[model samples]
Structures are given as C-alpha cells and as structure tokens.
Target: SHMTNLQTFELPTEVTGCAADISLGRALIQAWQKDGIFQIKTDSEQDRKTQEAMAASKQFCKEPLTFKSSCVSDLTYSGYVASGEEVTAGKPDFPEIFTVCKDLSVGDQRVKAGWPCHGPVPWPNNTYQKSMKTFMEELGLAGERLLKLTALGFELPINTFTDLTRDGWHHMRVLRFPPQTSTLSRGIGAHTDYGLLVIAAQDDVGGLYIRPPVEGEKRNRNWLPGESSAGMFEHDEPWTFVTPTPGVWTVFPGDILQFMTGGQLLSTPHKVKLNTRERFACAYFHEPNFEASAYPLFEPSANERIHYGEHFTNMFMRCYPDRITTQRINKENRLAHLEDLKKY
Candidate 1:
C-alpha cells in the first residue's frame, strides 16, 4: 500500500446537502430501496411493510416495549433503529435496486437486496458538496471548469464517460464514530473509497489522519495530522495540516477511479480517530453508472483492452467492508482475521 498524495481544491461558498441534487439523489435512493418502489412514482405493498418497519424501529430504539421474567410481562426496548429493511431475510429479489428505485428501466430485470440500501447510493445533508454543485452551476462552469474540478478532486478523467450535465454522479456520506476511553483503535480505520471520485468537507473540528510514505516501505510513512499542530512532526518546522476552510473542498482518490486511470491516480488509505470530541464531515462519492464502462483511453500506447467491470470488481473487493464492532471479542476477532486478508 503506497501513500498517495492529498489534493486540495478550493470551493467558493458553504453548501449543505439539502441544496444539492446529489444529496437529493441519496435520499430518494434510500427511500426507494426501503419501500421497494419509487415514492415519486407509485406505492406498493412492499412500501407499506417498509413504512411499518421504520415506525416500529424508530419507536423501539427510543423506548421500551415490554418487560417481565420467564415469560416476560413486558419487554424492554432499545433505541437503536433499523434505517432500512432486512434484505438478507429472503425479501423479494429485485434487479439493479438503484435503477429500479429511480424508475430508470434497465432492460427488464429488477434489483433486489435488503442491506442498508443507502450505502450504494449517496447520503444527504447540508454540506459543502451541495455548495460545490451550486457554485459550478451558478458560475456556468458546468462545462470545463466544473468537470475538471470534479476530476482533480475525484481523480477521474475529463469526459471519460458522459457529459457532466447528463451523467454526472455524486454521493454524500457522514460517518460517526463512538468515543474511546483508552487508545483510539483508528476511528473509521485506514481505507479508501470505491467510486470514481470523492470530495469531502469537514467542520472546524477535524479527525482525519493520513499515513505518510515510509523510507523503505511504499506506504508506511508518517501520519499526517488532520489539523495544524506543533507536535505533529519531529522537527520544529510546522507540519502541514488539512482542515476545512469554510467553503473549500478536500478531494481524495477512490479505488474505482484509480483503476480507471490505470493506476496513474491512486486511491490512498486514510483513517479517522475516536475520542470524546467526535468528528463529523460529509463526503461526496462521485461515480459513473454501473452500465457506463471504463476503457483505458489515456494511454494510447496500450490497446484499450480492459473494461471497467473487470477492474471495478477487483478493486471493489479490495476497498470495502469497513465496519465498527462494539464488543471486544467480536472487534478483536474481526481485526485479527482481517490483518492478513487484503481484499474485502
């Protein structure tokens, strides 16, 4: 694992997720996946079940249902809620869940699955992602400037697939980490994304940490502090710290994009920290549709032999399944198991 460079791109104004089309897409996608149909289009029996589950989970997470001994008179309820339906429980299978939910017909098959359907789609919130989109649209930079900005940040090529207006894709996400009493076991532990590009915006409070390249090892370098500080480096010279500069956006490489660029653009690994003062930031995961394939066109020397699906499938298995386990037994066991496992 080699340490990839961190690229910073400036944004004009502060933007929240509510204002961006990408954010809207995330919300709509989540809603569609849970309900088994697009809300904007029509309602179905599956939708009714989803709504009922949401309501029950919401209440269950908040308060107790009942409690008793042997055959409990009343059961105690937990506040934890299920954000989406239980897809693993043999639900009616659908094809291309996202396309079906968006009412975009992909031939005839329907997408199925009950995982946190939102994971595939982007998440929404009031953040810089929306602001960037609005900024580009407002300045009429939708053609050249906007496309380049997205490419630089996301590490994708210009016009690699479709025009920005028609097929431009983006996703937003906010990952929350619990507090740690002892040493922080790496907040959203070291990993990279799986999209064409990723643009992230953080609040004044930051918790991102990047490992610098080592002397001999390609990836075992020093840790880059997310904020400016004196003790970050061995020398007295100030260590460069990366933080949210109001409207500015911080771009990073994603696994898919790295493969699309034939390894020219690298999807570097980074991690988050867990402490009493938690961190919150929004990341826009920009990607092309699954149908849109990536063929290497940048290197004229090499024949355009590889397709996106082949590379994407390989890289996707390498970068995902970053989860947090609460129990010590499960956490330690899982970590040990993954220590040697490279791909997901």
Candidate 2:
C-alpha cells in the first residue's frame, strides 16, 4: 500500500496571477505536521521545465564517463559526483549526480572569504548549463512561494521563514539511477535531508519510499549502526512508495525545518530502490543563509541552537569522507567564514 497521508496541493506558475489559497496553505501545514511530505500540482509551463531539465540530464549522464568527469570540481556539491563518490548511511549510492548551487563568481564575497562550497559550478557545457540554471531559478521561486504559504497558513509574520532564507543557499541535483543488477541493489539508502525544504521532479519509473510515521516511535528510530541501515527498512512497519505522478513535484521537509518547528513538523526518512530500467530525477534543496541560526520557533527547546553552516559541515564530512580526506579539507577549513563575527 502507498502513503494515504499524501496530499496534492495546487501551485500557480506565477505568483502575481492570483491570491494565495488559504485552504491549500492549511492543507500544506497539515501535510508537514503529519507526513512531512506531499506533492504539488504544477501548471503546464512548470511541467515543461521539468521535462526540459530531465532531458538535459539524461543526455549528460549518457555521455562517456571521461567526458562527464571533465567538469568535476574540487568545491563540494558544485559539480559532477561520480556514482560511488557519494554515500548515504555510510554506503555508496548507485546514482550519478550533477549538483549546482547558488551561483557565486570568483570575486563574490563568500568566495573571497574562502567559504566552503561557495565557488561557481563547473558546468559541462554552456547549453546544458543554461537549461539547468533556468530550472534552478524556477525552483527557487517555487520554494519562496511554498515558504510564504506556510507562514500564511499559521498566521505568523508573512516573512517568518522567508526572511531567514533571504539569499538562500539553494541547490539542485540532476540524478540518473542506473538499472538495478539485483533486487537488493540500492539507488540511495535510507536517510533524512539536512536542509529546510526539498522539491523533486521525476519520471514515472518509481522507487522512492517514505517511512510512514508510526505511533509511539520517533521518526529517526532506525538511524543507528549506519552501514546496516543502508539496506531496506529492517523494521516491522511498512514504508510507502512515493509513486511519481507525471507533472507533479514531490515536496518534503528536511531536518532543519523539523528542528525549527520543535519536531512538530516531521522530517521523514526516505530511500530509493532503483528501477530495472534507468530512472532520471531532479531535486532542489532549499536552505537558509549560511550564517542563519535555526532554533525552535514556536516551542521550548532542549536542543542547542546551531548555525546552518556548521550542521552542513558535519553532515558533509560524514557523507563524503573520501572527498574530505583526499581534498585535505576539514570542519575548520569549511567553516572558516563563520569563525570571525567581525566579518559580518
């Protein structure tokens, strides 16, 4: 059986054409509180953009490995990551991905400050780069609208989330999941995202599954013994498939958003099992500013407040250990910009 809590909310392609739908906003809030995941119905133009990006991604991934490797960058999460170079739950994931983050030129203050993951993307070519860049910008706008709707739904200041996310460090990934060699071959392992929001578009070859919340259990119950957890859900409860509906973008909250809401908004753990045939997808991660400190917004917190950059550094270190060691980067180097408060 699939996730029954899944809801589809309609989003206008352009924000100026209409007023915000309070009812949809309310439904979105409910989805976050419950499953922390849902789908958004997009207009035709938005759907076309999704198709265009996927087409570009497919062509790029199909190229010879050497050709794709030509654009690899030392900057983390800013360019091509070979299939085995990235991991989840301490295991190599099967898909090859191309990542592009918020554009920063060589002279940008962040780049000049030696901020980690802040350099420009090393795009394979100008044409493919143009297509993906446009797609990322579109997703950036969609994320803004979603954040605004969440604020409106709760009757908070309209900019409650958006303000913290100003000049957001957003990024998008175009991934290709090769056909599985066996039933057990993994596409990506079970894990929760580290950002605030995630918007993903995929073709109909289904594999995504969200571990549905169960009574008297924490959402991250299976997080221990990392390597073993890389396999299928080893628990008794069922995980539900996020079956793709053509033209709809799957939306979900990540750990930061859940932490900000004091666990009221769930950050569900999900995993993928590759299809027999190849699968293609594009996912946008919406994050707050590098220096933003996320804390409990509406509830008392036992957890200490943390900067988004620090949290990201820890996660990146764990997930990309090989890269960190080989590249000679560490937490201190990655977080150098955040060290001197006077720089702000």
* C-alpha RMSD of candidate 2: 4.0
TM-score per prediction, in order, is 0.44, 0.87
**Candidate 2 residue-wise lDDT, 1-344, digit = tens:** 56465667787554331245555667788876566577898878788888888888888887888998777555555777788533344565567888888677778987776777667788888878888888887788889888877776776666788888888778887888777766666567777777889999989998888775566765542222342223444344567788888779988887777777766676667788888888888879988887777777886545556577766655666767766322645534645555663144
Runs of candidate 2 with Cα error greater than 4 angstroms are 3-5, 12-20, 85-93, 221-234, 300-303, 324-328, 331-334, 341-344
- TM-score of candidate 1 versus the correct structure, residues matched by position: 0.44
**Alpha carbon lDDT at 111, candidate 1:** 22
- Per-model CA lDDT versus the true structure: 0.33, 0.73
* Model 1 lDDT at residue 106: 23
Q: Deviation in angstroms for 192 in model 2?
A: 0.7
Residue-wise lDDT of candidate 1 within 1-344, one digit each (tens)? 12223332223233222235334334422322222111121124322332332233223223322210111100011011121222423332111110101111123232221111111212122232233334323322212233343343333443443442243334334333334434623334355555555545455555555433223323211112232222232232212244334444454545554454555444545555544644445455555543344444466676543233233333322322231212321333423322222222
TM-score of 2: 0.87
